[PDB]
């Protein structure tokens, strides 16, 4: 599973997610990656999110949109919303994984509850950071 979120110089947010799914997958299974609000969501009023982990749980908790809803309706910070969803609600359902999120203010979060998440980020005209482990 791979993903990208971006805030551009004009204040627009976008997200994308792509996957081959899981090793030994039952043919016909669909995880969170292609489902709007589960594995992918973007809204200029809130946040761009791409998810990765136990796809069944990201669907049942609508992880991507839940970040957006907590911020939009709840008034939570990007950091509060990410902590709630990734660190509390997903594990409560037996979910593991993480996501990348950029809010309308260009705040960035890359939460995960797993041992690893292949990830990288950087501000435009600035030096990028990569990451594997915590």
């Amino acid at each position: 599973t791979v993903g990208a979120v971006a805030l551009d110089l004009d204040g627009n947010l976008a997200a994308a997610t792509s996957t081959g799914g899981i090793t030994n997958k039952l043919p016909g299974r669909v995880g969170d990656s292609p489902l709007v609000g589960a594995g992918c969501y973007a809204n200029n009023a809130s946040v761009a999110v791409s998810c990765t982990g136990t796809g069944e749980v990201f669907i049942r908790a609508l992880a991507a949109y839940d970040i957006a809803a907590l911020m939009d309706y709840g008034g939570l910070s990007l950091a509060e919303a990410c902590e709630r969803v990734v660190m509390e609600k997903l594990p409560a359902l037996g979910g593991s994984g993480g996501l990348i999120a950029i809010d309308h203010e260009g705040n960035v979060a890359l939460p995960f509850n797993t041992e690893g998440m292949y990830r990288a980020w950087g501000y435009a005209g600035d030096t990028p950071t990569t990451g594997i482990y915590r």
């Binding site: 990208a4 971006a6 627009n12 081959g20 090793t23 292609p34 709007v36 973007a42 041992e115 690893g116």
Partner: protein, 155 residues
């Protein structure tokens, strides 16, 4: 102001099984793709084109379980899925269960921009793509020895 984050998946990663030479390969790929994305954003490209290109590169990179280097299903096939969403319009495109398209994220983007639909699945998604001029690929192009060995291990 402008900023990009990317990921190549969570949960698949264990220090005790990784070599440092594998870690470096991943750091290089992640760093090269986020940089492509940064240059695009500095040059005034849209968030939509930027996330599209970033995910296209992650698809093309055999290190990542998307497009080339996709995991295998129980039937030793590849079934690919992708979504893209524009925060300005709430417009979104998505394909699920595609086998004969090289870049799912570009198929998802074709559904968004060249259909009234959000989500297309299976042969119908592929026929829609082909009709709009997207190339049909043989499904073996995504197959990698590393992923195939992981399938045999899982059994």
């Amino acid at each position: 102001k402008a900023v990009i984050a990317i990921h190549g998946g969570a949960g698949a990663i264990s220090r005790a099984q990784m070599s440092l030479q594998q870690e470096l390969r991943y750091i290089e790929a992640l760093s090269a793709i986020v940089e492509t994305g940064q240059k695009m954003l500095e040059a005034g490209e849209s968030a939509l084109d930027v996330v599209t290109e970033a995910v296209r590169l992650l698809e093309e990179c055999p290190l990542f379980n998307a497009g080339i280097g996709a995991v295998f299903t129980r039937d030793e096939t590849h079934e690919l899925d992708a979504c893209v969403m524009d925060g300005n319009t709430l417009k979104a495109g998505a394909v699920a269960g595609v086998s004969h398209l090289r870049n799912p994220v570009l198929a998802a983007r074709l559904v968004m921009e060249q259909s009234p639909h959000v989500m297309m699945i299976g042969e119908g998604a592929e026929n829609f793509a082909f009709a709009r001029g997207m190339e049909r690929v043989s499904p073996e192009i995504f197959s990698t020895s590393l992923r195939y060995e992981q399938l045999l291990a899982a059994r």
